[PDB]
Symmetry: C3
Subunit: 150 residues, 3 copies
Amino acid sequence: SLRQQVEALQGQVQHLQAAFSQYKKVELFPNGQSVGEKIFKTAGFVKPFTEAQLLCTQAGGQLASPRSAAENAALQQLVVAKNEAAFLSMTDSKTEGKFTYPTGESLVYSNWAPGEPNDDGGSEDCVEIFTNGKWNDRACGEKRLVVCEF
Amino acid sequence: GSDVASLRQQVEALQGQVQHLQAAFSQYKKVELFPNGQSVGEKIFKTAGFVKPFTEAQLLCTQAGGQLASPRSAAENAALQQLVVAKNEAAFLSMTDSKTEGKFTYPTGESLVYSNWAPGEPNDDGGSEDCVEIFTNGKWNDRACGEKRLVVCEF
Amino acid sequence: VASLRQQVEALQGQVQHLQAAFSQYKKVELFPNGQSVGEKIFKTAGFVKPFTEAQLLCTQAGGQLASPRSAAENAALQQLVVAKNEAAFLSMTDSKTEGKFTYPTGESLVYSNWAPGEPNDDGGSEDCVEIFTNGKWNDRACGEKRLVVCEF
Ligand SMILES: [Ca+2]
Ligand SMILES: [Ca+2]
Ligand SMILES: [Ca+2]
Ligand SMILES: [Ca+2]
Ligand SMILES: [Ca+2]
Ligand SMILES: [Ca+2]
Ligand SMILES: [Ca+2]
Ligand SMILES: [Ca+2]
Ligand SMILES: [Ca+2]
């Protein structure tokens, strides 16, 4: 009797594994990218930094925060697909010249374009990632592709 | 006799498989609802991102296995309001007083258990407003069903 | 034992709760850009692309271009095409042997819904297939841009 119930439960779990795997592919197409235990997903539209940041936070995640070459390449895929530069979560709003994650932690990885960050006009505290994957500091008031990470 | 050992192993394996599914699915729920969904309690609102007349909007939700947004509490209404605000487009609710003027009901025929009418509403303006729209401020207003509003379904 | 059945019953409760949550999130997932039919799921990207680019998007996503293999699957796909009011590309081509359409695997068609007079290989250069809002098929040049719909 027990073995019968266990084998039934085994069947339910096996079905869920197959169904879940199929569903993951469906969900990620065409606005998501999975890399490691992280998932990037674009909203498909642009917003100023503050608005983009709130959208990600309210959704239970945060703005894209690539921490390795692998994560950056994954994010770049979405930027390329939408052909629109996107905002990252990091800023040097607290201390000019020092970029940090929303927590306050210093960067553990960076992929700055040549000469960046340059605080152009003395007012660039946010970061955007181009279609080539390189980063550039940009005015937080500009509108860029919204991409969150979960 | 000691066959319980093999069954034991199977159970221990299942526990690990279930924990994996739970963790993985917890993450995908958040991913899935961004940026067009909103969960509240055990209900989920999902917008199509475009506008349609009531009849068309109703059919879209029903064919999808759900129904038009039907907030049953202040909390559900506020959750729906978040989507409407984000899209900046008033949306249709599921209720109408098409059967009996002045009496709004859900698609099932049940009378409303919650409402958030703007002052003076419903007013059946022009004697032809049997559908309901929710504004970006969360308030309700009866509106002509032929008008086009944001499509938001609940699942 | 007893301590095992209690464990199984508790675990099964969790699994059935998971089955319920999953079912709900699946319906949410498919609205409004997807459609399920049998064990297959169609999902549109919501934009148009030339065949090669569309085929790459689906492959990279772990699926392939829409490949209706029955009247039921074709009707399901038709719903998305109608909803978007944009004809979409199917996965099949007759690039290897003109006049003989096959799936990406090389297998011959097991179902077709060609519009009257098709496939005609117009201009002697139509090796891809599009499905209209009326559900009928027509061979079209692969370089044209059509709605991207993948199947999983
Ligand atoms: Ca500064
Ligand atoms: Ca700066
Ligand atoms: Ca700069
Ligand atoms: Ca009336
Ligand atoms: Ca009325
Ligand atoms: Ca009114
Ligand atoms: Ca040819
Ligand atoms: Ca041909
Ligand atoms: Ca033709």
